[PDB]
Design an enzyme around this catalytic site. Structure first.
Site, PDB file in Angstrom:
ATOM      1  CB  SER B 440     -30.049  39.516   0.708  1.00 43.62           C
ATOM      2  OG  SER B 440     -29.210  40.633   0.854  1.00 43.62           O
ATOM      3  CG  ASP B 519     -30.522  41.971   8.274  1.00 43.26           C
ATOM      4  OD1 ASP B 519     -29.514  42.694   8.028  1.00 43.26           O
ATOM      5  OD2 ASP B 519     -30.908  41.059   7.530  1.00 43.26           O
ATOM      6  CG  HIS B 551     -28.210  40.011   5.747  1.00 46.76           C
ATOM      7  ND1 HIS B 551     -29.435  40.565   5.475  1.00 46.76           N
ATOM      8  CD2 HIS B 551     -27.679  39.659   4.554  1.00 46.76           C
ATOM      9  CE1 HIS B 551     -29.639  40.557   4.175  1.00 46.76           C
ATOM     10  NE2 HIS B 551     -28.585  40.020   3.591  1.00 46.76           N
TER      11      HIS B 551
END
Lengths: 576, 576
Positions: B440, B519, B551
């Site tokens: 991330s 994502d 995600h």
């Protein structure tokens, strides 16, 4: 689930098992073997039973040694997978000491022979495919070849080889080590598949015709072609459909390996020599013994002596892995035009019947699914998939006619053959669900299948695949450009309409893409565009791009990186 | 000799170990726990010998239940990873029977609380972040929020929450269940990190200031903010730097979880309660017992009773894996401007010293590396890497000032903090070679380090990364757009110059990219363009794109698919 670590245990051990090919005899009475061993492709001397490693770092191949030469010429990619090869001399008395042959700049080295005095090889650059000679006088280009060409044999000054010079047909060529030049001998009835120069300086060649294969002798002086008569009739009565290899042994005997129905037989002067069932490679005379390589769907390639079948060098499968291969058979699948497609079937001991089944199309075109060890198949069987391996038109091993049917028709008849094998798997009671996994042309076929026959497979794996004939063409060296030209019939329309990137809208099934980043055969660039198109259209896809690697895998690391995600992908789709 | 199957065995077991978080108490004396168990994120009831799974298919989370309600609201992604959630009611008497709350269109569900009568949640769509209520009267939008906002607590008709409404600061907000509306309460001294409505209908909130944290009472009627003094002084003596959570128990006692230096303590009415060392989550009263969740760098999240430390629900690590974690410590690394970066170091039992060390930046910004279980860290330690986990500026846990230094300066001071930790690992004798792995914002950081500090790491792994702030911003929903605006200070120039896509020329180290295809926080599309640029410039890169995943990983399959290539990449780079 998915027992991830069991799959990796199996897969890594299938990759790790020693695999050997026989390359010739050097420094009088030592065997030259190329082996996958200690995690990489290495070259070894064997004297029965030290095995001495000749190279430092992994290699890609060795050039064919003439009997008893005191050196080995290693062919090594020096471009991280893009297959720009350099040549490295190793004196057999000083293993591990390599000498780059600097005269030769990196190029895609296709084939070659070392006479002891001179190194003769075919190589491709951006602009040409050429026949080269490296002697004390430096590097010489002996002749420019029209397309892919391979050196088969050298005797005195005569060089004989096989050229892919048009229409997918294979011509015999000769050149001269002194003067150079190119004499091309085409046959009207088939393609030459192998060649060796007889003591009388004629070229004995395997000729693969419409259905049958035979031996002929070509006189390079006047181009006359005559049937070769052998003192024994075992060979002719065998009715071979392909010739794997042939060669004159040092004692003047003609060794021939011929095949039918995916299995080979060894003949010396036409006389059948007893050999383990499976496939065999070149035959050498070694300490008065006939030695060959032997492989089958359950036997990793190994060096055996004939006729006893006695292993000289073999890697043994762990028993748990042996048990996972329930068995194999050849079936004849009726395709769309009434053609029968010779398909090898590998039944998994770890799957029910009916059971999950992968149609495995790896390599090609002009490859064959025979009774020969396949790591992809074994590793699928170990993961609980039955394996179906169709010799779709364009494959070798079943005659010139079957092999030439692909020319001008990629993603046409051959894709129908692969589909027919899938259908057969369901209808015959083998397959409860179908997947397709392909590498190389097989990867191309996966994409054609998912785009052209959505619904047939549950999921597909495309490794090192062709997605666009056109951009690939633009990015190809002289050899691959010519090969694309032959495959497509020189038609840019065929290049376009038979490219799956142009039919992405049609994909309904999950797809895993696996691609080495430096592949110079099937480049990555077009694949990035396909992934953009998949993303933009909301398609489910998995992708794996492997670093510092190309179409030719020569280490375990790379092999695991290419193969593991394919198996994980299928294993996972099996649970859904 | 990278032992693939050994690493897979460790990594799959580390993912597999059950991990529990405490959500609350339902129907009336059962614990509601969300657990990673049976290979997925599930919701369970626990009564002290049985654990009852409430959901069918894997979920993402559950809404906070008020004590004793006869139902659970599951939050489940219905977009294959894109985090467009639907809500699903399960009556606690009929587990496995789900009822989709169809009045609520799929949207990114951020937070929510279920009173038994009404479901109150914050949710982000393309055009707005909003506070919503679902009762018998249907769906109502109570208020539009400026940016990310989270419901903290409801009592009667008063709703309290935390809002990220500007400059990275956190505001308290209140709304009304009947009338709606929005009252916003900003503090000049710091940010609110937690909130709970007292019996007197005032908001007790954790206020995080420059260096210290404290408790305040906010009267929503006039906006007065006064210090909350508690009958016991253990809490003030504790000198906490952050508040994890606070809540009023059914008996009116105030439970507070506060931390400092990456470790928490539990206080009831300011009185310290004995708790296992590590971090704790929310505290519930269950059958007259204090129950919390507990985790540490060696203890996967579990449910324990206080003050005894008695486990109610825990997954046990296998012995071999426990031993692979040699130890942990907190160090203070001097950064570029004299700041001390609080860095947790996890020493591997399977690496020498000095040894191969991964600087791990996972999650963020506003996250914290604490003495809390991290599956990435454990799985690196198990593969023979030491792990260095720096709380770069922008992290939470060390006061408002440190947390806000990132605002307007992504790929700036914080990257210096990360580099300073890499340097220290090498200078102090811990690291013989450095790698960086990030997920991330951490993935962003990997890309920033390789572009901005080539030669610092040997290789990097960027998972679910930011590569281009500009394109990401164009593809973001209203919450992420606002967050990007806040992080970049609303400057288009910062967006551009702090995007590693613009610095690709500079990469000298091998890089592995891992990305889930759906994502919706850090989209894939900009990644495809990065790959094109890496290809065109001859850069070494590995890439894995994970299908049908986003995600937030909620299955073992997906976790293996993201984590395994990352470890394999590092293990392979380690052999060089």
């Amino acid at each position: 689930p998915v027992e991830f670590s069991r799959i990796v245990r199996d897969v890594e051990r299938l990759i790790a098992v020693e695999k050997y090919s026989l390359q010739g005899v050097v420094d009088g009475d030592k065997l030259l073997v190329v082996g996958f061993s200690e995690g990489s492709v290495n070259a070894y001397l064997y004297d029965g039973g030290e095995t001495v490693k000749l190279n430092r770092e992994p290699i890609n191949s060795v050039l064919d040694p003439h009997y008893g030469v005191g050196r080995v010429i290693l062919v090594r990619d020096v471009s991280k997978g893009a297959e720009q090869h350099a040549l490295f001399k190793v004196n057999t008395s000083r293993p591990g000491e390599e000498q780059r042959l600097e005269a030769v700049k990196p190029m895609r080295i296709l084939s070659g022979v070392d006479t002891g005095e001179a190194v003769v090889f075919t190589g491709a650059t951006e602009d040409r495919v050429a026949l080269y000679a490296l002697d004390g006088g430096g590097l010489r280009e002996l002749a420019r070849l029209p397309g892919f060409g391979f050196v088969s044999d050298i005797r005195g000054d005569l060089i004989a080889g096989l050229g892919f010079f048009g229409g997918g047909r294979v011509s015999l060529f000769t050149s001269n080590l002194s003067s150079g030049g190119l004499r091309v001998f085409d046959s009207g009835e088939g393609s030459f598949s192998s060649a060796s120069i007889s003591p009388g300086m004629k070229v004995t060649a395997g000729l693969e015709t419409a259905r049958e294969a035979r031996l002929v002798t070509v006189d390079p002086r006047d181009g006359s072609v005559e049937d070769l008569e052998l003192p024994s009739k075992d060979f002719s009565s065998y009715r071979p459909t392909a010739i794997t290899w042939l060669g004159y042994l040092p004692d003047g005997r003609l060794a021939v390996v011929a095949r039918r129905e995916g299995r080979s037989a060894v003949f010396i002067d036409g006389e059948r020599v007893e050999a383990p069932q499976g496939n065999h490679g070149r035959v050498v005379l070694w300490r008065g013994k006939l030695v060959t390589s032997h492989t089958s769907l359950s036997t990793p390639p190994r060096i055996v002596s004939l006729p006893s079948g006695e292993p000289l060098l073999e890697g043994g499968l762990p028993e748990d892995l042996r048990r996972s291969i329930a068995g194999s058979r050849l079936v004849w699948v009726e395709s769309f035009d009434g053609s029968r497609v010779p398909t090898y079937v590998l039944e998994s001991g770890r799957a029910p019947t009916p059971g999950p089944t992968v149609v495995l199309v790896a390599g090609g075109p002009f490859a064959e699914d025979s009774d020969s060890w396949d790591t992809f198949a074994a590793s699928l069987a170990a993961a609980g998939f039955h394996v179906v391996m169709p010799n779709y038109r364009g494959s070798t091993g079943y005659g010139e006619e079957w092999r030439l049917k692909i020319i001008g028709d990629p993603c046409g008849g051959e894709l129908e053959d692969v589909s027919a094998a899938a259908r057969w798997a369901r209808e015959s009671g083998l397959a409860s669900e179908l997947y397709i996994m392909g590498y190389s042309y097989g990867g191309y076929m996966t994409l054609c299948a998912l785009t052209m026959k959505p619904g047939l497979f549950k999921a597909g794996v495309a490794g090192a695949s062709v997605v666009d004939w056109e951009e690939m063409y633009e990015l190809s060296d002289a050899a691959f450009r010519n090969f694309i030209e032959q495959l497509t019939g020189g038609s840019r329309e065929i290049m376009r309409s038979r490219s799956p990137i142009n039919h992405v809208d049609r994909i309904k099934e999950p797809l895993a893409l696996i691609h080495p980043q430096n592949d110079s055969r099937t480049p990555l660039k077009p694949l990035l565009r396909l992934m953009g198109e998949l993303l933009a259209r909301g398609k489910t896809f998995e992708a794996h791009i492997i670093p510092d690697a190309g179409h030719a895998i020569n280490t375990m690391e790379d092999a695991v990186k290419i193969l593991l995600p394919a198996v994980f992908f299928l294993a996972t789709q099996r649970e859904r």
